[PDB]
Design an enzyme around this catalytic site. Sequence first.
Site, PDB file in Angstrom:
ATOM      1  CB  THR B   1      -0.582  -0.093   0.897  1.00 29.28           C
ATOM      2  OG1 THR B   1      -1.286  -1.044   1.424  1.00 29.28           O
ATOM      3  CG2 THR B   1      -1.750   1.482   1.074  1.00 29.28           C
ATOM      4  CD  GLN B   2       4.242   2.541  -3.426  1.00 33.31           C
ATOM      5  OE1 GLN B   2       4.706   3.450  -3.971  1.00 33.31           O
ATOM      6  NE2 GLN B   2       5.020   1.173  -3.907  1.00 33.31           N
ATOM      7  CG  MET B 107      -2.054  -6.334  -1.602  1.00 31.69           C
ATOM      8  SD  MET B 107      -3.437  -5.284  -2.890  1.00 31.69           S
ATOM      9  CE  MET B 107      -4.038  -4.482  -1.670  1.00 31.69           C
TER      10      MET B 107
ATOM     11  CD  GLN F   1      -6.055  -0.408   1.473  1.00 34.22           C
ATOM     12  OE1 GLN F   1      -6.866  -0.932   1.075  1.00 34.22           O
ATOM     13  NE2 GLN F   1      -4.839  -0.428   0.567  1.00 34.22           N
TER      14      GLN F   1
END
Lengths: 212, 230, 244, 195, 235, 222, 240, 231
Positions: B1-2, B107, F1
């Site tokens: 997640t970024q 992810m 997100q």
Amino acid sequence: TTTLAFRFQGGIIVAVDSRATAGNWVASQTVKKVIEINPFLLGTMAGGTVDCQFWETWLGSQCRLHELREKERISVAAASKILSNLVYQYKGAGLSMGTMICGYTRKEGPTIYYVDSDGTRLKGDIFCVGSGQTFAYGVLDSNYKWDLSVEDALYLGKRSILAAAHRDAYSGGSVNLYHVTEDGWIYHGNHDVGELFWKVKEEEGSFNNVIG
Amino acid sequence: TQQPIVTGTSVISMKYDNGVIIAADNLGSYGSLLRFNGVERLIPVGDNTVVGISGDISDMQHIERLLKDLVTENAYDNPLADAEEALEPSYIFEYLATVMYQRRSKMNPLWNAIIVAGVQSNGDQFLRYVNLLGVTYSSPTLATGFGAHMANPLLRKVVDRESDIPKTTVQVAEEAIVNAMRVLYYRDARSSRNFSLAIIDKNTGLTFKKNLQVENMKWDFAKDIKGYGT
Amino acid sequence: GSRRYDSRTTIFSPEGRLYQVEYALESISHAGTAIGIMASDGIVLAAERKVTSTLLEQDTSTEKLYKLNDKIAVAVAGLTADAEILINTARIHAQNYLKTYNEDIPVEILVRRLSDIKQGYTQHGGLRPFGVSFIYAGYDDRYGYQLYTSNPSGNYTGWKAISVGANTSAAQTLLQMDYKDDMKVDDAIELALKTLSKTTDSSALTYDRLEFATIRKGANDGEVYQKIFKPQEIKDILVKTGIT
Amino acid sequence: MDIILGIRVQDSVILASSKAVTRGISVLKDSDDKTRQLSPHTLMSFAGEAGDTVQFAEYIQANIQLYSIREDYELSPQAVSSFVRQELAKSIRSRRPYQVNVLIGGYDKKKNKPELYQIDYLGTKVELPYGAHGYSGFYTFSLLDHHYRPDMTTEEGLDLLKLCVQELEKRMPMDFKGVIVKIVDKDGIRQVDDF
Amino acid sequence: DRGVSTFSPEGRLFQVEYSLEAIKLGSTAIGIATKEGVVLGVEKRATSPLLESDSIEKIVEIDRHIGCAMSGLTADARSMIEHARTAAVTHNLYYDEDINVESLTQSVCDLALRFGELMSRPFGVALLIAGHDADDGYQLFHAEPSGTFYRYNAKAIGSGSEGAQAELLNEWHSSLTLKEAELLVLKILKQVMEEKLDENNAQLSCITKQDGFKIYDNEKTAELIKELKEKEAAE
Amino acid sequence: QFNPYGDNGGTILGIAGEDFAVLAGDTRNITDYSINSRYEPKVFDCGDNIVMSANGFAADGDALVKRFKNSVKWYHFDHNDKKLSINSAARNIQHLLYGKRFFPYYVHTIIAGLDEDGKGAVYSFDPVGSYEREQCRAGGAAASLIMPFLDNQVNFKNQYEPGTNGKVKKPLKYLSVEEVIKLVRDSFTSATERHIQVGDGLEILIVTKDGVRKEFYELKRD
Amino acid sequence: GYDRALSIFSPDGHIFQVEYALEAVKRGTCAVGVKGKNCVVLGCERRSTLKLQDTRITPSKVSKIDSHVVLSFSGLNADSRILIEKARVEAQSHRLTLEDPVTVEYLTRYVAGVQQRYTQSGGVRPFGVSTLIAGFDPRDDEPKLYQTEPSGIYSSWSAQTIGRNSKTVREFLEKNYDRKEPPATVEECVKLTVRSLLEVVQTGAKNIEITVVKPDSDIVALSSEEINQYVTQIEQEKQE
Amino acid sequence: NNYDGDTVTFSPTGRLFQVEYALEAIKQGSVTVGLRSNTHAVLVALKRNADELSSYQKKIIKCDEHMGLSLAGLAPDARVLSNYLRQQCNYSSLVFNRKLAVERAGHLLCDKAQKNTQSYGGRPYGVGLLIIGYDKSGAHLLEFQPSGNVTELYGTAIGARSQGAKTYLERTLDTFIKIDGNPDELIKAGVEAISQSLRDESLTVDNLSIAIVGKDTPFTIYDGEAVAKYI
Ligand SMILES: *[C@@](C)(CO)[C@](*)(O)[C@H](CC(C)C)NC(=O)[C@H](Cc1ccccc1)NC(=O)[C@H](CC(C)C)NC(=O)[C@H](CCc1ccccc1)NC(=O)CN1CCOCC1
Ligand SMILES: [Mg+2]
């Protein structure tokens, strides 16, 4: 789904509908919800299609390996417990299953086991599983006797699915019948609700709520 | 997640009769702050491929390093590294597409949209897109970000389908690209006036143009506009 | 590679014997003799220290007799360092059982597990076995007073009276002669000492070359007490039986 | 799962456990036996999360049966209860804990005394004259406080138990389809067929 | 000593060659392939008369369409059979079909050389794998601990193998019926066996497309033994 | 997100005849309200007379097709160049999909070909691996528009014999390749009219014993 | 981890470590198994060089694996415990998953498989143990008697013996046991078992152990006096 | 002698005896031939049987549509190495959409075989391979030896009596290299080449094994009645 199976004088009746849904979208009317595990064992499917399909097919492979290793057909109790122990390992992961393992063996006689995805395993004479289980129970319970004939038992199973297929929006398509005896399971045909409803209404005089 | 920090905006491109053209501005935005102005977002690989990258710049610099290392690795134990066994545009793309999808599947994506433009060994034009999701597609014209909404409409007036490619010259094609870059400067709040442009031709090869500017702009009509109604 | 230097500790001989286990038993046969005698009202543990020096601190010493818990003790014969590794394991195992079941560990269960560890070193791992033989003396509410022995092979057996270490052949004959089933603790104390006195390789048996311990129900009402004898207490019991 | 009760009297321990198995708006079964025999003189009833209950009960049953074969000896009710507690105490800090509450009724043959242990899913153990899990306790405890005496017979204990089931059948919201009653004493475990 | 996976100067693996000697000590097993089926027969060889011979299981089912006979250190075969059964069933699960006899054999032979310093030594048992599939029909394979397998029209393994193989060379033709093949296995087994052949110390089996893999009863084999003796006396 | 899934639109359609089977799909590729490509094929010849399409999230679709194509290749290597039957392919795909049960391929998969009796076959899959053989299946964005039309025209549902008082049903019969292509073209022109994610072009793959043929038709580009 | 291949082939095709494990079995005390018409009896020798023993607590030679199956052995005592423990665990695991106790054949097959695994695993030596496994399958009255050995092979026996001087007692059983008519009663079966051990033992005092297993988990061990009565009876009939 | 116990040991003259003993297993193997022109590349292999009742051991294995090999020595080792090549060719296709170069295929096999000759416990591969293929630089023929050494050639042969075919190809070099756009004639040359290694036995219909790859020809294998044309 609506699925049932009950035990009686002449063995086991197993009856299921054939509908599959994705929300309110009717995806299929011709789904096989009974899996033929061997000539003496049946499995019913309710809940997530793939979960049931995949793991009951896998169950059949495990049962085949048992009779190769042990030179003897697997018991209904042992078969059901393989499935229940498997789903228990996945408990909490999100599997969705309501299954019934039905069959005859010499040591057990006719036997039905309820197995679901939160790990419950129950031996019993009568079970109805699925979104329309309550509708099937209503007809089945009120007409059930142990001394039913093979002919009458087949009809009651068929009639119970029809009752649920009618009232439950997520049940329908067609009825698939099975009879399990000491000699094995016997298929008693696919019965489309399209024709079956009107045939039953006319001949039986029931379903007076519906416009004839 | 970024979350992306220093970002680059639109990359635009199209096919023409003998090759492909690609362009992208030289800006590195830090949110609304137009932080860095000397950023090159077109990266040549060999003399037959140009990779245009938008999105996160730290991830762009990582991809630069991967392509640089790919050239080195291809040259190892390869006598035909500058001939038959040279890196093709299709090889470079498939490698990046593989990486992008593997990263989204873990992810932890490379927060970019990428266009690989080039010419194959048999002369065929190559132009394909890939992004952070691993989604890939090809078209006579391709663009990222605001380019997708504003450039593509203009470029599709020149090349609307496949049969329009042979009928489109390099002069006509470059004119459309330069025009599209002007429109993006009018309308994209995270764009700059300075940009780079690259042409890959099957005959004349790779031409890399730096320090271009948007010009011939219409602003004069602004003086007549007064108030917001009355 | 390293195959060249491997002794292969866990293999059979052509005769079906385990080389290393046999040689470990040969090692143990040179260690100071230890005797265990089980009476109807208690158990005696007697052991001979290995050739003592006059400048050895005798009172603050422990070589042969070790406490495993309040109800179980062991007499050692072999490498002391090896024994202490096993003793700490046995001590921990007893506390695991107590923690789990809230009951003191039955003697045999403790003995079996310790013997199972020894067995492992003879079948796998490629390490040398433990050069130790134990005499276990203990009490529980199932079988009462119990004597066991284990050896490097990991095999264990129960006994009424038994000896390990040096001169076990001569010692076992003497015990077999004078032992009887209705025996008391005080009589067993006398038998244990008399047997060491005759089998010893020393000139004369003295207090400074012995370790002694009893396990009686000689506490107050239905409870077991472990007595590890002090030097002066061994001196007195040696005079009381007329050996010195 | 729902109702499990236990009463220790002079010479025996009596366990009562509901017969219903409900899922959603359907009573799937009305003859379920929520108990396992751990050893000839030790019985464990259980209640809690679906699947977990039977899986846990049978796992304990297997371990105790293994012990019996290995030592050729029956563990005391106290020893079995401690083993069970520790397993639940481990479980509560696992990735996915067993959500199971149990009652362990046994007859100690060495002491010649009946013993009843109540253990919750956290691993909280207590020895009691009478015990219950879930909402059952909110009715039965106060009732037993009044009517229970320590010197009662097995017959007196069954009448005392009938009084508890009657109260539950009057004031509980859900239909639990009656109970299966089992007695644990010096002669082992037996089931009362007419309750 | 020396490495387990060492080559000899002639270019052979010592341990594989030594395991082949163990197989020569084993009891005889014969297989014959016909267009009507494949027959598998073995010598039981009880070490003592008190041993209940029906518990000697040297012919084994892998799937409904694949059978297996063994010779050598028969204890080593258990994990090979276990693997074969799993391979057969697993393929049916992944592909909703029967698995080819050749593919099954190849999967078993992949275990063979997975030894060294994986297991500590090669298998000391050879296998005859018989079966049928839709593509290549009735088949007989000989699987060795070298990791090699040959297809055979007929094959004998064990102590009386070289003598039995020479006999099979003369007797086999492409038009053999199933009944003819049954008698031929019994005939050749009776020749190479030490003790006199009967229904208790020898066992027959076959695999046909229609009925699948079947181990014969002692009553059925006894009649085929009686039929065989009568035919040899008739000329 | 970060959201690892996306929707690339489009729709697909499979119909089976007596001795043939078709697998059609539009060539439009989209994200949100933008067109990415007017011609991006998503129906693929996978070998062994098996055609396949995985519609939905294109990145997952391409990944799946890529893995199945590779599965066919290794099937040949491991089983002596044996032809992979359509029923075997279907079961193999179920395991590919279910292998990611807890992080699914976001696609509706349809395969088509001939069964081992030479008769036309169509299998359809949900995103996690459930499958079923059918005469008829539409998949993707416009599936809900096309599918009921197919029930009526292919399987003659709700159609009775004229004059028989709604007692005798219209009898089932196989359709010719000509009649099937007519239904496919009409299904997609209708879907193009009423669904925004469908258009640009139609690409049909027909499968007979002779091999795999292709046909292409223009669709409205608005 | 210790990896060495200890069990390996030799030029003549033998695995010496497995064969040397059989020598350990040959050294062990004699064990005999005889099955009758409605029972199985397991007899075991106990050497008498050990006096001052405590027989209450000393490990018995016959071990219960479950309530319906028993296991006796010959060879290394310490090794036998490891097999017995594994067998006991597998017995409970079978009841848990199959909801039915093990058959005698299944339990034997498992133990034999363990023994085999130790013959081709790196870093381990074979078990110096051969076992006699006897009992009755669930809801079955047919007696079962199986034998295993270090190599891993197992088989069923009408009657069998293992251990030291086993070739002498096997000779006795081979002529004294009739397949057509096995020992009809418990007394007949025990007597034949005691007779066979008396060919080898020495004295019939505290040297012979006898364990009788009957259908439906009915297992009992005989005491000294009970066994001594068989010894007294056999010797008086012998003097003839 | 004292320096052949394992692969990790050098002899006093600097030899690796276990690698040499692995090389010996190839010499015992049945003969196989490889040759190429500019357009095509051909493998010819003499198959071997156990007896008249047995099948003939297959010598040729396909690695991709454009690459494959023939074997001589331990067949299981060929299965391991060919499976590795199949994966490497496949990795190159899936990741780079690129047909693996035949030269890189050799480099990969070399490096895999080498690791087995420098570590304790392991052993060298006991098989030699002839790899043919057609890539972006035309036709190729490689010779693999389990020492690690890989060599690109116009033609070659390995196995028992391989010197006869290797001499013939050395004479015929100028002729067969220019057989372009003619598959049958290039095979005929390969069949005549392997015939120089025959003793007492001749090429029969279920004995011969041929494989070809080229410009407009995928890697295919011919057995049975399909090779009757070349006898
Ligand atoms: C009665 C008929 C209804 O409950 C029965 O219980 C049947 C049982 C039969 C089919 C064995 N159950 C269903 O039909 C079942 C209901 C259901 C749905 C989702 C979760 C649990 C239960 N339906 C399905 O499983 C459908 C079957 C398809 C239509 C063939 N499948 C889906 O809904 C799939 C997979 C759902 C899923 C489960 C677990 C993880 C991820 C997904 N979902 C989709 O296809 C998504 N959707 C289709 C429509 O287009 C948008 C995307
Ligand atoms: Mg409905």
